[PDB]
Amino acid sequence: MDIDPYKEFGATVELLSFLPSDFFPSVRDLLDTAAALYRDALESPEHCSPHHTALRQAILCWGDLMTLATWVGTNLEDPASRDLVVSYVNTNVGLKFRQLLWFHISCLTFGRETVLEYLVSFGVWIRTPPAARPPNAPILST
Amino acid sequence: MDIDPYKEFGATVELLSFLPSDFFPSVRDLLDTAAALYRDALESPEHCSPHHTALRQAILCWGDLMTLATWVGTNLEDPASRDLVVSYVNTNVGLKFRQLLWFHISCLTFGRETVLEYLVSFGVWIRTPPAARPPNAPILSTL
């Protein structure tokens, strides 16, 4: 069974690894932003949007991963060395959520296509050597 | 940030724990049920329903979870400590996803309210004294 988290939103995992791995904020920063910009819709009893639905599942999923990695770090080894279980999650999967978290928060703010366009525009822009690219990078707004 | 997976769907975490711990299939059974019944709608570029989108995340999330919980099985040694993660997985989250997976597969199959009513009814039935309850439990079948 093969599911692209983005296919239903008009994008893919190809399109997101299209941006450099350091382009995205941290997972901790992206969650802080979710609360700060949307908590009431996110805690609301309404669907609101497919982006809202997806965002809530993605926030909570990182919750299911972190909770599991912390309870499993505590039960054999030192709280100073047990951060290999939480280290592990930020190496394999931590990058994946960084893309996914950002993608939806961004889509809520500016509009799905805006973010889609922004990804292709900013993507070809970052690859372009300094001398060949405009001084004004693509910008993300309404 | 404090979010109920079910609130937007007319349910709550209280409401699903209304049901016994053993009533739900394994996760492994639920995903194979899902694959076999829905692979094509779930793999579609279409939302279909809020249930579909929430489901896709959850199926995919269980993928990310097993990847983590198995990697710590690799880093273990004791025959009682390797079995420390799949003790938790069968207790804390495996139960959570079993409910969540089940809630959604079912809603797609039978209808949101259908699945909801069934939860109250089966819930009150299991709580109901044997001798006071009908022999025939509330039923989950194709409307």
Curated annotation (Swiss-Prot), chain B:
<protein>
    <recommendedName>
        <fullName>Capsid protein</fullName>
    </recommendedName>
</protein>
<dbReference type="GO" id="GO:0043657">
    <property type="term" value="C:host cell"/>
</dbReference>
<dbReference type="GO" id="GO:0075732">
    <property type="term" value="P:viral penetration into host nucleus"/>
</dbReference>
<keyword id="KW-0677">Repeat</keyword>
<comment type="similarity">
    <text>Belongs to the orthohepadnavirus core antigen family.</text>
</comment>
<keyword id="KW-1176">Cytoplasmic inwards viral transport</keyword>
<dbReference type="GO" id="GO:0003677">
    <property type="term" value="F:DNA binding"/>
</dbReference>
<keyword id="KW-0945">Host-virus interaction</keyword>
<dbReference type="GO" id="GO:0039619">
    <property type="term" value="C:T=4 icosahedral viral capsid"/>
</dbReference>
<keyword id="KW-0238">DNA-binding</keyword>
<keyword id="KW-1163">Viral penetration into host nucleus</keyword>
<keyword id="KW-0694">RNA-binding</keyword>
<keyword id="KW-1035">Host cytoplasm</keyword>
<dbReference type="GO" id="GO:0042802">
    <property type="term" value="F:identical protein binding"/>
</dbReference>
<comment type="subunit">
    <text>Homodimerizes, then multimerizes. Interacts with cytosol exposed regions of viral L glycoprotein present in the reticulum-to-Golgi compartment. Interacts with human FLNB. Phosphorylated form interacts with host importin alpha; this interaction depends on the exposure of the NLS, which itself depends upon genome maturation and/or phosphorylation of the capsid protein. Interacts with host NUP153.</text>
</comment>
<keyword id="KW-0597">Phosphoprotein</keyword>
<dbReference type="GO" id="GO:0046718">
    <property type="term" value="P:symbiont entry into host cell"/>
</dbReference>
<dbReference type="GO" id="GO:0030430">
    <property type="term" value="C:host cell cytoplasm"/>
</dbReference>
<dbReference type="GO" id="GO:0075521">
    <property type="term" value="P:microtubule-dependent intracellular transport of viral material towards nucleus"/>
</dbReference>
<keyword id="KW-0167">Capsid protein</keyword>
<keyword id="KW-1177">Microtubular inwards viral transport</keyword>
<dbReference type="GO" id="GO:0005198">
    <property type="term" value="F:structural molecule activity"/>
</dbReference>
<keyword id="KW-1160">Virus entry into host cell</keyword>
<dbReference type="GO" id="GO:0003723">
    <property type="term" value="F:RNA binding"/>
</dbReference>
<keyword id="KW-0946">Virion</keyword>
<keyword id="KW-1144">T=4 icosahedral capsid protein</keyword>
<comment type="function">
    <text>Self assembles to form an icosahedral capsid. Most capsids appear to be large particles with an icosahedral symmetry of T=4 and consist of 240 copies of capsid protein, though a fraction forms smaller T=3 particles consisting of 180 capsid proteins. Entering capsids are transported along microtubules to the nucleus. Phosphorylation of the capsid is thought to induce exposure of nuclear localization signal in the C-terminal portion of the capsid protein that allows binding to the nuclear pore complex via the importin (karyopherin-) alpha and beta.</text>
</comment>
